[PDB]
Amino acid sequence: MIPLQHGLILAAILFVLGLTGLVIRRNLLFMLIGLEIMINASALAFVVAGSYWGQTDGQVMYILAISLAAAEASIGLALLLQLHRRRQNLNIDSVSEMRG
C-alpha cells in the first residue's frame, strides 16, 4: 500500500541525480549516461502516473519513450565513435571552439 507521492519523489530524485551527472563530469560518455538515467527517471514518473488512475495509460507512451531512448543513445554513441575516430582526446574541452 504505497501512494503516488513516494514513487514520484523517487522519480524526482533519479531525475535530479541524472541532471547532476549530466552537469558535473567532463566525458561525453558520462553525460550520455546521465541523459539515459534521467530519461529513465521521467519514464518512471510517467509509469507511476499512468498506474495511479488505474487504466492503461502507463504502457502506451513508455514504449515510445524507450524507443526515443534507444534512438538517441544510438546516434549519440555513433557521434562518440566518429569523435574518437577524429581526435584521440575525449574531453569536451577539445571540442570547445566558438566560445562567446
Binding site: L35, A43, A45, E97
Partner: protein, 467 residues
C-alpha cells in the same frame, strides 16, 4: 473512432509526405542519385502543398484523440512546407561540391517535414511528443551532415546532448501534470494546485529550449555557426514555426493557462528574451551568429503576443502574421548566406568583415539581403513592421506596459546591428539550380516588399484560417 474517408482527407498532409519518404528511400537504394532524389523529394513537398487545398475542402474536425485539425493548422502546415521547399532548393547548390553520400539529405528533411506537420495538428500531449522528436532526429543528424569539418561535429554534439536533455524535461513534466488530471488531452487538462503548476513549469523548460528562450538560448549561436547554411534555413524557420503552434494551442485550450501564475512566469521569460537577445547581439562580426542572436528576440516578440492571447481575439491573427513575416525574412537572409557558398568549399568563410563590398560583386543578391535585413528590424515597407505593429497592439490591448516597452527599447537596441550589415554590403570591395536558388530568394524579396506596402491580402488569408 475508426478510419473514415473524412479522416483520410484530413490526414492528407501527413500522408503524402510519408509516401514521399518511402519512395525517396526506395529510390536511394535503387540508384543513389542526387538529381532523382532532389526531384522526388521536392515533388512530394509540392504535392503536400497541393493537397492543402483538399483538406480545406474538409472542415474543422478530429482524426484521433491525438490530433485536432482546424483551419489554424492549415496555415501552419503551409509555413513548414515552404520552409522544407526552401531548404532543399538551398541544399542542392551546397551539396554539389560534397564529396560523397550526397543523397541522405533529402530523406532527413522529409522526416523533419513529417515532424513539423504533426505539431501543427495537436490535441493530445502525446502528439506533442511525437512531433518534437520527429523533427529533432533530422536536426540531430543534419547539423552533423558533413562532419568532415571540425565544427559541424562540434555543433551536432552540442545540440544532440542539449536537445535530448530538453526532451527529458518535457516528458517528466508531461507526466507530473497527468498525475492530477485524469487525461493528458489539452482540452481535458485542467479539469491551481502546485503539482499541476509544477508539472507545467517543467514543460516550459522542455519547450523553451527549442523556442530559444532566455535561460536556454545558449545553443542558438553555436550550432548556427557550425551547421551548413542549408540546414540553418530549416533550423531557423521551420522548427520554431512548427513548435510555436503547439505551445500556443496548449495555452488556448487548457484552462490552467488562464491562471495568472503561469502568465507572470512566461511574461518575465519574454521580457528577458528580448533584452538578453538584443544586447548581446551587437558585438557579433559573424553573419550566422548574428541571425542566431536575432532569432532569440523574434521568439520573444511572439511570446509577448501569446501572453495576451487570453485578452482579446486579435492575438490569434497577430501571432500568425508575425510568423509569416518572420518566415520570409529569415529565408531570404539565410538563402543569400547559403548562395554565397555555391560550392561546398569545405568550411564556408562568412563573416560581417567578410561581407564588405558584395554589391559590386553580386548586386542583386546584396539587395535581397538588405531588404530582408531591414525587414527583420521594423523598418516600414516591409512585412516585419506589420507583424511588429500587431504585437504592439496586442500588448496595448492587454495593458502589458513593461512588455510593450521592452519591444520598443529592444527594437531601439536591435536596430544597430541590422543597419551595419545593411551598409556593410556597400563598402569598397576587399549552375541551373543555382539560378533556381536565386529565384527563390528573389521571389521572397518581391513578396516581403509588396506585403509591407500592401498588407491586406495576407490578413485575409489569416482570418480565413483562424477559427
Amino acid at each position: 473512432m475508426t478510419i473514415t474517408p473524412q479522416n483520410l482527407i484530413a490526414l492528407l498532409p501527413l500522408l503524402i509526405v510519408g509516401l514521399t519518404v518511402v519512395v525517396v528511400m526506395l529510390s536511394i537504394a535503387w540508384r543513389r542519385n542526387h538529381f532523382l532524389n532532389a526531384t522526388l523529394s521536392v515533388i512530394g513537398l509540392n504535392a503536400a502543398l497541393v493537397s492543402l487545398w483538399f483538406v480545406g475542402q474538409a472542415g474543422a474536425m478530429d482524426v484521433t484523440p491525438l490530433m485536432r485539425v482546424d483551419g489554424f493548422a492549415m496555415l501552419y502546415t503551409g509555413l513548414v512546407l515552404l520552409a522544407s521547399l526552401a531548404t532543399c532548393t538551398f541544399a542542392y547548390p551546397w551539396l554539389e561540391g560534397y564529396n560523397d553520400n550526397k543523397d541522405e539529405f533529402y530523406l532527413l528533411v522529409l522526416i523533419a517535414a513529417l515532424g513539423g506537420i504533426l505539431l501543427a495538428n495537436a490535441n493530445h500531449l502525446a502528439s506533442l511528443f511525437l512531433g518534437i522528436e520527429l523533427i529533432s532526429l533530422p536536426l540531430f543528424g543534419l547539423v552533423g551532415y558533413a562532419f568532415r569539418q571540425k565544427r559541424s561535429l562540434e555543433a551536432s554534439i552540442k545540440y544532440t546532448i542539449l536537445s535530448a536533455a530538453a526532451s527529458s524535461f518535457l516528458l517528466f513534466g508531461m507526466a507530473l501534470v497527468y498525475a492530477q488530471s485524469g487525461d493528458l488531452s489539452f482540452v481535458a487538462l485542467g479539469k491551481n494546485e502546485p503539482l499541476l503548476l509544477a508539472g507545467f513549469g517543467l514543460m516550459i523548460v522542455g519547450l523553451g529550449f527549442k523556442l530559444s528562450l532566455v535561460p536556454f538560448h545558449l545553443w542558438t549561436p553555436d550550432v548556427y555557426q557550425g551547421a551548413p547554411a542549408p540546414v540553418s534555413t530549416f533550423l531557423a524557420t521551420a522548427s520554431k514555426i512548427a513548435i510555436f503552434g503547439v505551445v500556443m494551442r496548449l495555452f488556448l485550450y487548457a484552462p490552467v493557462g488562464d491562471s495568472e501564475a503561469i502568465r507572470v512566469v512566461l511574461a518575465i521569460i519574454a521580457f528577458a528574451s528580448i533584452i538578453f537577445g538584443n544586447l548581446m547581439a551587437l558585438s557579433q562580426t559573424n553573419i550566422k551568429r548574428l541571425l542566431g542572436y536575432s532569432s532569440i528576440s523574434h521568439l520573444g516578440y511572439l511570446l509577448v503576443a501569446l501572453i495576451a492571447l487570453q485578452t482579446g481575439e486579435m492575438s490569434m491573427e497577430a501571432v500568425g502574421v508575425y510568423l509569416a513575416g518572420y518566415l520570409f525574412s529569415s529565408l531570404g537572409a539565410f538563402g543569400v548566406v547559403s548562395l554565397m557558398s555555391s560550392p561546398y568549399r569545405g568550411p564556408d568563410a562568412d563573416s560581417l568583415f567578410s561581407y564588405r563590398g558584395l554589391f559590386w560583386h553580386r548586386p542583386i543578391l546584396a539587395a535581397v539581403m538588405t531588404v530582408m535585413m531591414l525587414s527583420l528590424a521594423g523598418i516600414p515597407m516591409t512585412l516585419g513592421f506589420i507583424g511588429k505593429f500587431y504585437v504592439l497592439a496586442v500588448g496595448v490591448q492587454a495593458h502589458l506596459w513593461w512588455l510593450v516597452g521592452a519591444v520598443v527599447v529592444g527594437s531601439a537596441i536591435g536596430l544597430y546591428y541590422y543597419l551595419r550589415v545593411a551598409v556593410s554590403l556597400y563598402l569598397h570591395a576587399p549552375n541551373w539550380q543555382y539560378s533556381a536558388g536565386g529565384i527563390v530568394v528573389l521571389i521572397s524579396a518581391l513578396l516581403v516588399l509588396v506585403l509591407g506596402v500592401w498588407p491586406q491580402p495576407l490578413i485575409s488569408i489569416v482570418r480565413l484560417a483562424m477559427p
